[PDB]
Design a protein. Structure first.
Lengths: 129, 143, 110, 173, 93, 124, 242
RNA sequence: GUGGGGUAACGGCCCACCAAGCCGAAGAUCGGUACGGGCCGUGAGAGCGGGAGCCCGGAGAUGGACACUGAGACACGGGUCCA
RNA sequence: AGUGGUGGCCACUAUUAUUGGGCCUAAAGCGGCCGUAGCCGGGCCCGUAAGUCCCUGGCGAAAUCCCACGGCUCAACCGUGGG
């Protein structure tokens, strides 16, 4: 059973990247997935991404630019304050500011760097680098 | 499969699993039950005082060959009798029947028997409040 | 009607009972909690229950914890099983009773 | 509570590289024991840990602590007046050992050999800012460095002390 | 050579506290009598009403720290001051 | 000893091992048991904190009050009904709330004779 | 086990508001009961010995106190265990020196030197009001002192109002009400040793004190409890304040 | 739960009457262990182990039981009984 | 001016694995299946704001921790100020 669309999507993205496929289709096109896809695109990991009206859940189509070493979902959604970033960031980014974490906060799903700039906590949802 | 549980709200099963499989360790199990403290003839004493009962030669384990001298000692602290090695060369002459000896551990693995000598656990340190190391060296003299 | 220093509405009925917060002689002081009545067998009594999530530091996970509180049910309110109620602290009513119901925020039928 | 040693023993005592490096340092600077060297290295590690922790900290307290650390390090003379938080990781033990009382007085040419400097300091012939100090392991601040001179009542205040002309000749030679 | 660094007058008690340095380079620590006789000169005090509490010799320091008092009447020390310090200063047998 | 301390069984019914010997502040005193006789007999007991309580042991009179609020000192013929216990009224023991037959009629006691040292009742 | 009240005081457990070296000796003066709490007061002996340096030893301080040269709110206090608290006036007529005891921004007690004119006036908060036989009103203040007034005058005083008492003869001079815009000093809390103007009086149900919002001289807004707000003036403070 | 006794005082603390409640696998009762915390040792950290000089709180004065005086005691250098 | 012998705790040890262990042949998958509790759960929109995140008031004794400065010759120790 599909317990989670987001982790499956990120696993698919990484496995597609490793072989080197050009286009990736994400089957359970959820809103949180779309907000997620916006993020690393804003940071240049991917190119244009589009939604497709399939009539079941829609499908998210993305093209791969060969710039994603590994992407996954921090599953137990640990709540994190503003100061506790380096603790979790040391756990999921290979080096200092290498890659980005994604946080669901009061102001939306959005990048951990900008959250530090906004100085707002939230719940980690996924990591990619 | 994947390691479980992993949910945000499964602290209880994680803690219970860890407690359950911590007992399978032997070090922690020994410490909590204080089994050594129940089994120790020294009752936790690194050093103890006893009275020599007799002198025995024991054969070293193969392939080594040798006749290791040692003394049986009746413990003043609790009365239990234990065998203690006599270090040094020819030290057994200095030791005599009904001698107040002070023994400690021998230092084998897990505090057990050391080297090729099996079963022994302790070595004689002092005799009649004079140390065996000097007596074998001869610097001091037994009373 | 007499105000208890807490922001709810009184029960319409007036009970002669001297232990009613709105119709008795006792008073209110201390903490106020929201709970669910899960036992009403003892007379003028309820065994409210309160749930919460207690954090753990070693595992960084939450644990579900339930706390029972024996509270005094006045006859005017007459809380029953499954009713979300507001419970407040009083002087020691009994060996286990140190609380009284203030109102019934949600009845069982809803 | 009990007090604790201010120096950290090496993790393994018989590594050839560390042995030889410490031996070279010992012979050059002529300390009495490796205890002094280990104390100085522990001081170095303390400063480096403070720099590490501060470099990754954001907040007013972090800024104040950073400024204070740089101020003290400059006070010791271990850093230039335009130093930053980066080069502090590049400090070595030799920077500290150069700042020792014995090393400074010997570099001030009051001793033919730094062992003789140690004797002079011990016997109270060397005063710092007009105050004596009998610990050669004492660390000398930059400000103190110009006030280091012979003890007034000691014979070495006499220019005619028989060892004094030998000292000054070896300095000249 | 005596250099005073503080002279506090305790109007409640009626005493002048005296805190001072003594320069004795290359010399032993001066005796109580000598410092008292030197101190009384440039401050014009009565020796009987003046008492020197302590003379501490800092390690490796040729300047010694000294603390003394100078009251107004002969009864104040007897009523107030510890009996032992006068015995040290000899004002009591 | 009359020890007013913790219950030796937990709320769950688990027995408890007392951790300390009984303190002096925690002991109670004996039942006063005010009896019906022809004269007043009382003891003024020194209490904790140096204060006093006037304890009535034998009762002869009572203050009966009409609902208008006038008080009348009167005698007590006997005790009618004691809701606290069936034994008290049988043996002529007066407490608060019991009903007393006096010359005026029936009165209900709103005073605690063991504590207040007096008897006050409202006419019925 | 302990069988009665403590009488001694170990120097380590002393109130944090005292400028006392804590490891110097084992013992410290347990203050006697008095106008304030230990959290809000210090023994007078520490004032004489440490803070003022008038007496080096405790015995000299005790003798000076026996001489009766120290006036607390214009009263001789020979008890060297006498606790002196906040807004108290300490006076030395022999030196003519007048100080007020005030908290610090760190949360310790200090002596603010004042003029002679300001020594006869002590501002006292009104902690409570009560009715006493004879139909009289008893105002109970912050320092434990009490004042009696008639039933008629009752409406000129209210809880948390600040009365400028004349302690040399115990005469009321003025009443500062606890209303918006009143100038206030802070006694405790993180905002201790701050002074400003009231903006809001937030009531709260369920049993919490009225949190007051105070604007600072520079406009900074902060919050404190009603119990810590001490009205010092109407639009400017009426007493010198660090 | 009702009505009382008792207390400095609420309270089954205790009594009389009425009812059958109360806790439990989210581990009760029972058993072992042990004064608790401030802290301390160790480790890069996560964490692991001890309750120690000292501070705060508790309790004991050869074991068990009880009372007077006193604001404060069931009282280590006070009182009575049993072992 | 210390240096060895013995005993205990931590590290060594990812041989306790939340970070971060394994389970085909090395110790370890229940013989299989159903299912209660527990745990984990499809997408979109409206609502509450309990958890959550930010701000803010009281509070978490002192000593002990870390830091700068100052006193004992430096240090150990102690005071001042910050965390």
């Amino acid at each position: 059973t599909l317990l989670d669309p987001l982790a499956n999507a990120l696993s698919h993205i990484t496995n597609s990247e490793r072989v080197g496929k050009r286009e990736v289709y994400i089957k359970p096109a959820s809103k949180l997935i779309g907000e997620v896809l916006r993020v690393m695109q804003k940071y240049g990991y991917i190119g244009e991404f589009e939604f497709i009206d399939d009539g079941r859940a829609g499908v998210y189509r993305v093209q791969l630019l060969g710039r994603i070493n590994k992407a996954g979902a921090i599953k137990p959604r640990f709540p994190v304050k503003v100061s506790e970033f380096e603790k979790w960031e040391k756990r999921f980014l290979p080096a200092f500011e290498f890659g980005i974490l994604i946080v669901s906060t009061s102001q939306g799903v959005m990048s951990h760097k900008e959250a530090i700039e906004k100085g707002i906590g939230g719940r980690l949802i996924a990591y990619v680098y | 499969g994947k390691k479980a549980p992993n949910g945000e709200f499964a602290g209880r099963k994680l803690k219970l699993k860890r407690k359950k499989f911590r007992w399978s360790d032997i070090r922690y199990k020994r410490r909590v039950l204080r089994l050594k403290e129940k089994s120790d003839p020294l009752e936790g004493a690194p050093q103890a005082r006893g009275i020599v009962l007799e002198k025995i030669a024991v054969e070293a384990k193969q392939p080594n060959s040798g006749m290791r001298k040692a003394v049986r000692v009746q413990l003043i602290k609790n009365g239990k009798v234990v065998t203690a090695f006599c270090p040094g060369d020819g030290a057994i002459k200095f030791i005599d029947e009904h001698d107040e000896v002070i023994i400690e551990g021998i230092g084998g693995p897990k505090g057990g028997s050391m080297g090729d000598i099996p079963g022994i656990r302790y070595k004689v340190v002092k005799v009649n409040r004079v140390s065996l190391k000097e007596l074998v060296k001869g610097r001091k003299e037994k009373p | 009607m007499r105000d208890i220093g807490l922001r709810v509405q009184p029960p319409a009925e007036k009970c002669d009972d001297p232990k009613c917060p709105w119709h008795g002689n006792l008073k209110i002081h201390g903490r106020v909690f929201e709970g669910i009545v899960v036992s009403d067998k003892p007379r003028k009594t309820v065994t409210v229950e309160r749930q919460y999530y207690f954090y753990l530091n070693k595992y960084e996970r939450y644990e579900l914890r339930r706390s029972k509180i024996h509270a005094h049910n006045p006859p005017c309110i007459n809380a029953k099983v499954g009713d979300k109620v507001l419970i407040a602290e009083t002087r020691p009513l009994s060996k286990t009773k140190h609380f009284v119901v203030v109102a019934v925020l949600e009845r069982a039928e809803e | 509570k009990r007090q604790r040693k201010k120096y950290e023993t090496p993790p393994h005592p018989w590594i050839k590289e560390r042995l030889d490096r410490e031996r070279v340092l010992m012979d050059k600077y002529e300390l009495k024991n490796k205890k002094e060297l280990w104390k100085h290295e522990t001081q170095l590690k303390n400063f480096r840990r403070r720099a590490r922790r501060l470099l990754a900290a954001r907040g007013k307290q972090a800024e104040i602590e950073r400024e204070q650390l740089l101020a003290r390090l400059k006070r010791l003379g271990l850093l230039p007046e335009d130093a930053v938080l980066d080069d502090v990781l590049s400090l070595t033990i030799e920077d500290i050992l150069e700042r020792r009382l014995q090393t400074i007085v010997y570099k001030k040419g009051l001793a033919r050999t730094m062992r003789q400097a140690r004797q002079l300091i011990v016997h109270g012939h060397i005063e710092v800012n007009g105050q004596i100090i009998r610990s050669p392991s004492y660390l000398v601040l930059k400000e103190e460095e110009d006030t280091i001179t012979y003890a007034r009542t000691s014979p070495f205040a006499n220019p005619q002390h028989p060892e004094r002309m030998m000292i000054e000749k070896a300095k000249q030679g | 050579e005596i250099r005073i660094k503080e002279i506090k007058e305790n109007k409640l008690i009626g005493r002048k506290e005296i805190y001072f340095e003594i320069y004795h380079p290359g010399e032993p620590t001066p005796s109580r009598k000598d410092v008292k006789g030197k101190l009384v000169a440039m401050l014009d005090l009565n020796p009987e009403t003046t008492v020197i509490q302590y003379i501490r010799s800092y390690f490796g320091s040729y300047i010694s720290k000294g603390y003394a008092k100078a009251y107004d009447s002969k009864e104040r020390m007897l009523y107030i001051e510890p009996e032992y310090i006068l015995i040290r200063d000899g004002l009591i047998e | 000893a009359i020890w007013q301390g913790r219950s030796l069984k937990k709320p769950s019914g688990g027995r408890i091992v007392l951790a300390r010997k009984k303190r002096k502040r925690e002991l109670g005193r004996e039942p006063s048991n005010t009896r019906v006789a022809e004269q007043d007999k009382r003891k003024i007991i020194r209490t904790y904190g140096g204060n006093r309580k006037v304890r009535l042991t034998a009762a002869a009179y009572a203050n009966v009050f009409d609902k208008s609020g006038k008080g009348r000192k009167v005698r007590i013929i006997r005790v009618i009904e004691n809701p606290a216990n069936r034994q008290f009224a049988r043996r002529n023991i007066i407490t608060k709330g019991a009903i007393i037959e006096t010359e005026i009629g029936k009165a209900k006691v709103t005073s605690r004779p063991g504590q207040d040292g007096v008897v006050n009742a409202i006419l019925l | 086990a302990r069988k009665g009240p403590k009488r001694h005081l170990k120097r380590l457990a002393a109130p944090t508001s005292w400028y006392i070296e804590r490891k110097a000796y084992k013992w410290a003066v347990r203050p006697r009961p008095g106008p304030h709490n230990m959290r809000t007061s210090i023994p007078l002996l520490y004032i004489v010995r440490d803070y003022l340096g008038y007496a080096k030893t405790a015995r000299e301080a005790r003798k000076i106190l026996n001489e009766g040269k120290f006036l607390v709110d214009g009263r001789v206090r020979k008890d060297y265990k006498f606790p002196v608290g906040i807004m108290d006036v300490v006076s030395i007529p022999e030196t003519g020196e007048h100080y007020r005891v005030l908290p610090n921004r760190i949360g310790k007690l200090i002596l603010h030197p004042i003029s002679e004119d300001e020594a006869f006036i002590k501002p006292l908060r009104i902690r409570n009001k009560r009715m006493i036989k004879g139909a009289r009103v008893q105002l109970n203040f912050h320092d434990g002192t009490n004042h009696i007034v008639s039933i008629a005058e009752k409406d000129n005083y209210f809880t948390s109002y600040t009365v400028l008492m004349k302690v040399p003869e115990r005469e009321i001079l003025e009443v500062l009400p606890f209303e918006k815009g009143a100038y206030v000093f802070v006694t405790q809390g993180k905002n201790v040793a701050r002074k400003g103007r009231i903006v809001e009086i937030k009531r709260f149900p369920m049993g919490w004190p009225d949190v007051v919002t105070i604007e600072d001289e520079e406009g900074e807004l902060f919050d404190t409890l009603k119990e810590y707000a001490f009205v010092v003036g109407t639009d400017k403070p009426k007493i010198s304040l660090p």
